[PDB]
Amino acid sequence: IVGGYTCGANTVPYQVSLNSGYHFCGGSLINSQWVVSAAHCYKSGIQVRLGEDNINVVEGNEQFISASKSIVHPSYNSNTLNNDIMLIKLKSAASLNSRVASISLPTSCASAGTQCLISGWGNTKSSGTSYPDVLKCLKAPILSDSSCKSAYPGQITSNMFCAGYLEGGKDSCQGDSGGPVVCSGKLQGIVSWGSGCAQKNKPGVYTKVCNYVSWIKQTIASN
Numbered sequence: 001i002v003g004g005y006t007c008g009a010n011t012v013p014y015q016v017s018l019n020s021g022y023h024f025c026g027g028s029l030i031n032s033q034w035v036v037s038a039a040h041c042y043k044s045g046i047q048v049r050l051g052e053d054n055i056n057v058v059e060g061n062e063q064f065i066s067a068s069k070s071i072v073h074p075s076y077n078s079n080t081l082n083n084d085i086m087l088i089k090l091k092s093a094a095s096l097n098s099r100v101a102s103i104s105l106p107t108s109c110a111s112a113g114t115q116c117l118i119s120g121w122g123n124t125k126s127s128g129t130s131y132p133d134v135l136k137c138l139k140a141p142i143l144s145d146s147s148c149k150s151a152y153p154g155q156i157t158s159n160m161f162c163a164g165y166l167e168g169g170k171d172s173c174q175g176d177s178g179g180p181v182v183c184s185g186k187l188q189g190i191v192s193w194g195s196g197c198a199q200k201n202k203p204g205v206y207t208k209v210c211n212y213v214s215w216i217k218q219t220i221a222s223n
């Protein structure tokens with residue numbers, strides 16, 4: 001997250017860190033046995049770490065649980081990143097408390113202008129590399145689909161939306177991938193892609209979760 005702030009320990013209790021020996025992607029807890037992340041974060045051998053703040057220090061509120069199964073969206077296209085969403089089932093149910101909580105799926109899609117909260121442990125430098133150990137946050141508004149499409153001609157589909165600032169300076173970045181974009185108490189997006197990080201007129205592009213609620217509900221009930 002570039003141009004954001006330190007969230008505060010466990011202030012985003014639904015945020016997860018996907019670890020395969022190191023943190024490589026974020027995710028959101030949707031109920032005690034399932035996590036939603038991005039399909040471009042798919043790997044075999046994932047351990048889900050809940051209640052994290054500093055990912056290099058065990059502070060006492062963590063739960064490390066291995067995944068029993070991963071399900072990449074049937075229509076995920078790795079070249080265009082269309083349908084960039086995947087579900088991860090935990091081997092054991094997580095224990096929900098104040099530090100570990102699930103986030104609600106949306107009942108409708110959010111409007112351009114709505115302010116959201118994006119969080120993650122990804123790179124914090126636009127022109128540089130600095131990976132933080134504690135969770136960073138960023139408040140950003142959903143942009144109109146026209147500014148999103150004019151920034152990425154022929155690359156945005158109906159399953160994606162842009163959020164951020166066209167002036168540059170604030171954005172999610174590599175490492176934040178698969179993590180949450182929460183607007184009005186609902187999970188509306190998943191960190192997917194963008195051009196570099198925090199560049200002017202290159203906002204971040206997010207998976208539009210409201211288009212996948214039936215697929216999510218149907219898949220978790222059958223797995």
Ligand SMILES: NC(=[NH2+])c1ccc2nc(C(=O)c3nc4ccc(C(N)=[NH2+])cc4[nH]3)[nH]c2c1
Nearest residue numbers: 172173174177192193194195196197204205
């Ligand atoms: N397991 C891997 N090998 C892997 C996982 C995630 C990755 N993610 C990128 C990436 O290259 C990448 N993820 C991004 C997310 C947001 C933005 C943004 N500017 N908003 C830019 C991004 N670039 N490479 C990745 C490789």
Ligand SMILES: [Ca+2]
Nearest residue numbers: 054057058059
């Ligand atoms: Ca920790």
Ligand SMILES: [Cl-]
Nearest residue numbers: 055056057058
């Ligand atoms: Cl640790």
Ligand SMILES: [Zn+2]
Nearest residue numbers: 173174175177
């Ligand atoms: Zn990359």
Ligand SMILES: [Zn+2]
Nearest residue numbers: 174175177192
């Ligand atoms: Zn990524």
Ligand SMILES: [Zn+2]
Nearest residue numbers: 174194195196
């Ligand atoms: Zn990139």
